[PDB]
């Protein structure tokens, strides 16, 4: 399975997981492409903000499900 | 001026809090009590696997917009 | 170790242009915001501008607005100023400094500043 | 934009400076420190907590629209000049304030 990221500028990232992988994983797998820091990241599926400690598939997220990016750039 | 935060309970329900980040613990406590009649000295907060002092502030634990914090009742 | 590292400071005339440059080491530009701050002989900070390499994002003081332009290039690691229609009022310290989420809008890291002088 | 004002004070006193540069601001309020010829640093973030490493004698309050920079008791490394930055969310501008010179008193 492949997910894709959204960010607020439209670009996609594609992603390489598996169900097991937790938000934590993710998140590390999104440091490597764009080279941000996993504390920063805040992650959106359908509406819900995803917990680390869960696995994708306990938010029951499945192959080419869309995911969104939001960035802690500033701590407002 | 403040930023939206989320308190968990075991029982599942979620409570949204504005709180500024420059509030102290103590006043949070106090605001979960105005919403849901817990009383502060009963109540117990963690954010990211600590409890949280009451004569700190939410920028003094680095806790953010729409991030959750933990309740624990006490007995 | 987190370093901030401005340069290209020196003499231009009144009406004339000159680029700064903020190089950093230990952290990457687009992990946060970086700034320009500012400071005549005697006087106080005088915040200038920013920018979020990440977005393109920029922001810049009243007094600076259509003049001064600010830029990155995260491939360098760099942030650069670039100023026009320069006058005496903007000889100072040009100092850059970084903006990271844990510190709530404070800035948290200088270098040690760059002179500018403008003069005929 | 204009040169610091001055207040003298004895190591072991009180001081509270209190931040006037904006309006409506914010509540995200820093306090710098800064000797002459060398570069400012962070004390303060978001009004009232402490960044990395600075001493406890230190501490930042809010009350009404006012924010207070306190230092409770003047060690020798503390004098000084000192700055608040304030934030405007709407314009997304920051202003520094003023700067208070401590000095020493003798």
């Known amino acids: 399975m492949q997910i894709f990221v959204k960010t607020l500028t439209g670009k996609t990232i594609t992603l390489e997981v598996e169900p097991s992988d937790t938000i934590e994983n993710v998140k590390a797998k999104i440091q490597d492409k764009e080279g941000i820091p996993p504390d920063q990241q805040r992650l959106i599926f359908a509406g819900k903000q995803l917990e680390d400690g869960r696995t994708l598939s306990d938010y029951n997220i499945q192959r080419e499900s869309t995911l969104h990016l939001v960035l802690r750039l500033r701590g407002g | 001026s403040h930023m939206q935060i989320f308190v968990k309970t075991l029982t599942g329900k979620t409570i949204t809090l504005e709180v500024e980040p420059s509030d102290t613990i103590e006043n949070v406590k106090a605001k979960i009590q105005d919403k849901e009649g817990i009383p502060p000295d009963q109540q117990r907060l963690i954010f990211a696997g600590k409890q949280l002092e009451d004569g700190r502030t939410l920028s003094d634990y680095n806790i953010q917009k729409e991030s959750t914090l933990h309740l624990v009742l006490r007995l | 170790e987190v370093q901030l590292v401005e340069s290209g400071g020196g003499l231009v005339q009144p009406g004339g242009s000159l680029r700064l440059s903020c190089a950093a080491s230990?952290?990457?530009?687009?992990?946060?915001?970086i700034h320009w701050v500012r400071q005549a002989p005697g006087k106080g900070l005088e915040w200038v501008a920013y920018?979020?390499?990440?977005?393109?994002?920029?922001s810049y003081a009243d007094s600076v607005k259509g003049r001064f332009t600010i830029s990155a290039d995260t491939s360098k690691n760099t942030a650069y100023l670039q100023m026009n229609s320069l006058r005496a009022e903007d000889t100072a310290v040009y100092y850059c400094?970084?903006?990271?989420?844990?510190?709530?809008?404070?800035?948290?890291?200088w270098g040690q500043g760059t002179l500018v002088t403008v003069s005929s | 934009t204009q040169s610091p004002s001055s207040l003298s004070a004895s190591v072991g006193d009180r001081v509270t400076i209190t931040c006037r540069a904006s309006?409506?601001?914010?509540?995200?309020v820093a306090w710098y420190q800064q000797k002459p010829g060398k570069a400012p640093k962070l004390l303060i973030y978001?009004?009232?907590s402490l960044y990395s490493g600075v001493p406890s004698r230190f501490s930042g309050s809010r009350s009404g629209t006012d924010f207070t920079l306190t230092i409770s008791s003047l060690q020798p490394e503390d004098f000084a000049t000192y700055y608040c930055?304030?934030?405007?969310?709407?314009?997304?501008?920051?202003?520094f304030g003023q700067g208070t010179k401590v000095e020493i008193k003798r």
């Open positions: 400094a970084r903006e990271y989420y844990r510190w709530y809008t404070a800035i948290d890291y």
């Open positions: 309006q409506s601001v914010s509540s995200a």
């Open positions: 930055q304030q934030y405007s969310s709407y314009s997304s501008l920051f202003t």
């Open positions: 978001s009004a009232s």
């Open positions: 920018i979020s390499p990440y977005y393109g994002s920029t």
């Open positions: 230990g952290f990457n530009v687009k992990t946060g915001l």
